Amino acid sequence: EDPTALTQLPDESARVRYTSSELQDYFETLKFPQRFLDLGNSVLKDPSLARTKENGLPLLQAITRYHTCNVPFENLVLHYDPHKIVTLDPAELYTKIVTRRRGGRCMENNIFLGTALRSLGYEVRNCGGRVSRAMSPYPEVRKNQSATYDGWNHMLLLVFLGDEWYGVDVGMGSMGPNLPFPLQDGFESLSIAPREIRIQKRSISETHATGPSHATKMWCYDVCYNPAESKKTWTPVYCFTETEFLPQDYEVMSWFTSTNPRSFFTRYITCTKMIMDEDKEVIIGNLTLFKDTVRETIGSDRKVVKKFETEEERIKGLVEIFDVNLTEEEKNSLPQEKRL
Amino acid sequence: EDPTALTQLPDESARVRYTSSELQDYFETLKFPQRFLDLGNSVLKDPSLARTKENGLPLLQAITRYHTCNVPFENLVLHYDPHKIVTLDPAELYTKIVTRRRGGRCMENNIFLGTALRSLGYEVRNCGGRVSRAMSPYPEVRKNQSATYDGWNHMLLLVFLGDEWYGVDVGMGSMGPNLPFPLQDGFESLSIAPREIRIQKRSISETHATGPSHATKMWCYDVCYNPAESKKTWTPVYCFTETEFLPQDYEVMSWFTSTNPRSFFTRYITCTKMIMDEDKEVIIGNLTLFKDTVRETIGSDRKVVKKFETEEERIKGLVEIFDVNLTEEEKNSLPQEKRL
């Protein structure tokens, strides 16, 4: 039958807002220690703190750090699922991430996080971007096309603190900036040592502009994996604009990455949690399952944790290593050609 | 197998250019009269004329007017086609529109036109937009969601003439501006009497902004079907930004509109050409096939031309009314559920 309603951004009075109690349950899923529970509760009691740099940025730093370490970046809904459809509904996302302790990709993570932050009192714009082909898992695409970008396929947040916007992104696993960054041309920071991140406003290589008089510029997020090299090499990760993206834009973007056969997410299973040094309040590495193999990276050192031999091993490994729990129907929904 | 190359914008030296003879063949497909053949030839001989408003705009006006009257806005590639996939390759588009005298939707039309205009010497930026739900063929969507917009799904061009960008769009059938329009906030013009068009820079209804200090603005294209009313009603048609879109962005957008089962293009056959008063150099109406019925509207008056009874009737009508010629494989590719 013809649709009678299409996806939209609800009017302000109709939008999902996570309650104080649901946000507390999210702080517990994040496994906040006492000092950050206390920080979160002070904002719960005074949302005006979420508008300032001095009181809003520290809780924002803590939320983003524990989120990428405890909420998995995963595509299992396209594999271990009977329907293989992505929901971006903020209430269903809450259940998936807080109650079920599952995760997802950039749109599921950052739609949820945007809803949580606005519910805490933050001013949050949903934005859109393009992942660099330098991040492609296809080797010839990395080699020949690293200056190009995908079609719109990434989500990040801009959060307004005091007098400045900050980029916020908890939905890109170990490729992400993994820090709230000031939206500042030329900002650089250590992020997951030895890696550095950089933000620049610049034209991208792909353009029909015949000269600078007609060029446009994007915000470009790059990383330097090894800043100790004599000549720093910056690897592009994604580019984005400040345009407000809508739920139905993400629906278009997610449809492509979830159903176009050239999206690697339709082809291979992947699941990532970042690794924290809690006392030093920094991320130091990541655990990543790709296809059949779990690897732990700490700084520049990478080692294999497990190469799964069977479906049973991979399923138990998702529980024990990632706290990713599947229903019976989800386990049995994996297509036969993808099983171990 | 894993992709070895993804869609990208080619480097300037590898981009498709239409030759002077290919552009001449396009002018004949447009059915230019002699005065516009003369005007086109003068730009083929002196490409610097395409850089000025005084010499570039007249040819631009004539190209866009004859294009929407003579190149069909159609979706038959999703229906009367064995493979039902959309190519955005500018060489294949050339063969489709100039040689085969077929058409397409917004991205096929405007990728082609951008390639042609850049080949004539114009400075052109590919841009992206969202169609208003006020244009939805779904009655309940129109009634309840007219203030909202689709996810990114429209392409238009910005053409820089002299010191001023112009909006150019030959890819929306009867809903389009059907005129090059100056990218000026508040521009209004008659376009297809009695309809008026309007361009405004303004925020759209859907926003997470809690107030105007954090709000964003879009270029918004609205129409007034009946400016004679005591109180003018403006109907939203699409919104866009100046961001340069890439071929791979359009690939994402077209993938949704061509494969998501809530896109109306996946459901119903549609084909439109505009109707010109050639001597008065204005568009006055349109011919539109929708599902099984052809209607002619001239201004505000609409009448049924034909309600097709059989497949043979619809196919002959496409030839006779729209000069849309199908191959035997294309005719026989229509799913049985869609036949008459």
UniProtKB/Swiss-Prot annotation, chains A, B:
SUPFAM superfamilies reported for this sequence: Cysteine proteinases (SSF54001)
Note from the entry: Fusarium verticillioides possesses 2 unlinked loci, FDB1 and FDB2, necessary for detoxification of antimicrobial compounds produced by maize, including 2-benzoxazolinone (BOA). The FDB2 cluster arose as a duplication of the FDB1 cluster with rearrangement and expansion by incorporating additional genes.
Phenotype caused by lack of the gene: Eliminates the ability to metabolize BOA.
GO MF annotations, alphabetized: arylamine N-acetyltransferase activity
Family affiliation: Belongs to the arylamine N-acetyltransferase family.
Enzyme Commission code(s) on record: 2.3.1.-
Active-site annotation: 106, 154, 169
Gene source species: Gibberella moniliformis (Maize ear and stalk rot fungus)
Keyword annotations: Acyltransferase, Transferase
Protein name: N-malonyltransferase FDB2
